[PDB]
Amino acid sequence: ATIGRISTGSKSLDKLLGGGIETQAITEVFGEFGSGKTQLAHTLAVMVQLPPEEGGLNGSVMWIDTENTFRPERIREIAQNRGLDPDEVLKHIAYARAFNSNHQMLLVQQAEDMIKELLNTDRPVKLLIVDSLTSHFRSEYIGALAERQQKLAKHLADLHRLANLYDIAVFVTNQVQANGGHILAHSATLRVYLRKGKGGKRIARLIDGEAVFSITEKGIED
Numbered sequence: 146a147t148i149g150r151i152s153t154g155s156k157s158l159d160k161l162l163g164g165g166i167e168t169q170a171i172t173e174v175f176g177e178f179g180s181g182k183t184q185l186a187h188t189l190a191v192m193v194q195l196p197p198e199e200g201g202l203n204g205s206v207m208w209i210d211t212e213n214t215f216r217p218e219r220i221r222e223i224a225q226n227r228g229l230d231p232d233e234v235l236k237h238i239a240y241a242r243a244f245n246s247n248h249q250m251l252l253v254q255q256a257e258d259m260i261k262e263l264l265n266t267d268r269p270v271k272l273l274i275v276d277s278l279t280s281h282f283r284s285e286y287i288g289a290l291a292e293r294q295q296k297l298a299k300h301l302a303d304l305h306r307l308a309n310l311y312d313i314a315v316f317v318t319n320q321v322q323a324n325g326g327h328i329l330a331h332s333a334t335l336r337v338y339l340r341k342g343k344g345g346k347r348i349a350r351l352i353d354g355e356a357v358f359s360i361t362e363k364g365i366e367d
């Protein structure tokens with residue numbers, strides 16, 4: 146398949162990303178608590194459902210939530226201010242809460258079943274969100290870094306296999322603050338550092354210029 150791109154909702158961020166996040170890729174956004182990573186996830190879950198002329202892929206979404214941060218009412222707001230029907234947008238987001246890191250890993254295997262079901266339809270899965278990818282692994286493997294890295298490595302390998310095999314954009318969030326961070330090392334296809342700036346602006350930089358955007362009723366925008 147060719148490489149598809151999903152607009153983030155921000156012309157600035159899209160330019161930094163060469164058009165948007167890519168299918169057949171894992172995009173990892175990392176930054177401190179409150180930097181806007183989950184807002185970007187919510188926005189992408191709407192943007193992907195637009196037609197290509199508007200920066201989407203007419204795609205369905207699968208969302209794995211580890212922190213109970215998915216908000217359907219926020220999806221509704223973004224959709225209504227992106228000219229989409231909110232009920233239709235929510236109907237094309239498959240949502241699951243991961244209870245722990247082992248359940249999170251099983252959910253990725255379960256996602257493949259729905260990906261296969263929708264593959265030949267007019268609304269194939271084009272976006273798989275894992276928010277937060279690292280939170281359960283971090284809490285469960287305190288004092289056991291070597292074992293944590295083994296499990297994370299397999300999890301990321303599973304996500305890579307889905308991205309490439311089924312032409313999906315995988316978007317993952319990772320909280321990194323004071324003293325923290327191996328990030329995801331070199332595992333993602335693309336690392337995006339997100340931070341707060343003056344006056345509520347958000348600033349994005351590729352790790353390995355900078356885009357600037359705001360969180361609004363449209364999700365994010367310049």
Ligand SMILES: Oc1cc2ccccc2cc1O
Pocket residue numbers: 207208209239240241252253255256259
């Ligand atoms: O209905 C489902 C929703 C999911 C969401 C995320 C990951 C896996 C899922 C599997 C489902 O059957």
